[PDB]
Amino acid sequence: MMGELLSGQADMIVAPLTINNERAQYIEFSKPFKYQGLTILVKK
Amino acid sequence: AGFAMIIVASYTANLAAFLVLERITGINDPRLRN
Amino acid sequence: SAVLEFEASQKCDLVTTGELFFRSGFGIGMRKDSPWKQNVSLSILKSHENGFMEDLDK
Amino acid sequence: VWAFFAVIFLASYTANLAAFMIGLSDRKFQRPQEQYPPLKFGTVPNGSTEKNIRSNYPDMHSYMVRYNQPRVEEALTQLKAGKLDAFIYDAAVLNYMARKDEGCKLVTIGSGKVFATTGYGIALHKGSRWKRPIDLALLQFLGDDEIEMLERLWLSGICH
Amino acid sequence: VWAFFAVIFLASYTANLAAFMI
Numbered sequence: 001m002m003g004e005l006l007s008g009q010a011d012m013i014v015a016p017l018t019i020n021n022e023r024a025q026y027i028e029f030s031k032p033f034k035y036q037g038l039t040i041l042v043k044k
Numbered sequence: 045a046g047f048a049m050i051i052v053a054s055y056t057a058n059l060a061a062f063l064v065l066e067r068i069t070g071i072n073d074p075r076l077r078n
Numbered sequence: 079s080a081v082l083e084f085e086a087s088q089k090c091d092l093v094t095t096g097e098l099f100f101r102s103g104f105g106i107g108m109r110k111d112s113p114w115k116q117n118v119s120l121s122i123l124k125s126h127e128n129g130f131m132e133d134l135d136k
Numbered sequence: 137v138w139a140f141f142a143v144i145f146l147a148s149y150t151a152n153l154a155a156f157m158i159g160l161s162d163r164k165f166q167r168p169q170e171q172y173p174p175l176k177f178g179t180v181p182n183g184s185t186e187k188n189i190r191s192n193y194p195d196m197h198s199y200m201v202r203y204n205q206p207r208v209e210e211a212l213t214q215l216k217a218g219k220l221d222a223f224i225y226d227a228a229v230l231n232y233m234a235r236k237d238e239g240c241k242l243v244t245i246g247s248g249k250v251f252a253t254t255g256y257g258i259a260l261h262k263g264s265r266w267k268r269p270i271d272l273a274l275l276q277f278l279g280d281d282e283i284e285m286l287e288r289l290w291l292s293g294i295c296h
Numbered sequence: 297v298w299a300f301f302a303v304i305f306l307a308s309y310t311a312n313l314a315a316f317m318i
Contacts, residue, residue, distance in 0.1 A: 011108070012107070013108070017105065017107065018102050018103075018104065019103060019104075019105055023107075024272065025268075025272055027107050027108075027109075028115065028271075029105035030105045030108075030115055030118055030119050031122050032103025032105050033103070033104055033126070035253065036080040036081075037100040037101050038079065038096075038102075039083070039096040040094070040095060041086060041092060041094050041096075042093060043092045044091075044093045050146070054153075056308075057154060057307060057310075057311045058153070058157060060312065061315055064316075065158070074292040074293070077289070099284075126253065127191075127192075154314065
């Protein structure tokens with residue numbers, strides 16, 4: 001996504017995208033709207 | 045009597061099981077931290 | 079977190095047990111020169127304040 | 137014949153059961169006119185919660201003429217004494233009080249949904265040169281999975 | 297008289313032992 005946006009065709013990303021360093025200094029973000037973490041899923 | 049007696053016996057067994065249903069386990073415990 | 083728990087609730091044939099060992103949010107990205115960024119941040123916080131967020135959530 | 141089967145079945149059943157033995161959206165909070173709420177849902181005097189309520193439900197703000205402004209400690213003391221009915225305040229501080237609370241008082245519903253989910257920021261200046269470095273350092277710390285350690289050192293609790 | 301005391305005593309004993317089994 002951000003690679004293709006930096007390519008130039010895309011102009012503004014709207015997706016369930018997380019927040020992390022390298023992409024943060026490489027492109028800034030807006031204020032968060034949905035909050036989550038990391039979790040395991042398994043069958044019973 | 046009968047059904048009532050057996051249900052009271054079951055309730056008494058349940059209550060007896062209910063009655064039977066060291067606070068620091070290392071420096072990592074938060075009781076000492078606070 | 080949200081995706082996995084929502085899918086598990088939808089299917090209710092699998093169990094979600096892991097603890098939230100991470101904290102993160104979802105944002106909107108755009109080029110490094112954008113008044114749209116400030117305005118959309120204000121609009122998103124407005125949506126949070128008014129109650130549209132959990133409205134669409136429910 | 138039948139009696140023995142019945143008694144063994146009931147014994148198995150008894151053994152199995154003994155083994156198993158081992159917000160304001162609510163109607164009550166929605167009505168300020170009703171006399172049932174003994175108190176007026178105390179809150180901090182000039183908090184962001186006040187302006188949120190006044191910009192969302194002015195009727196609640198009007199009904200909130202009586203509130204425990206000065207001390208959160210005195211507010212929780214009165215609530216424990218049975219005087220106050222309910223308290224409304226920031227989720228993080230109430231959670232911290234509950235974690236270290238003596239008596240283990242639940243907060244809302246057992247960590248129910250919080251109104252206007254937000255975060256804690258840093259009060260910077262307009263167009264400060266430190267904005268980008270501050271964001272970078274904060275996010276690097278967040279990825280460096282140590283704020284969890286600081287929270288466990290500071291925000292620990294017993295009641296769980 | 298005696299029978300009821302005996303049976304309740306034995307029921308309590310059985311409950312206690314099954315509890316210790318946990």
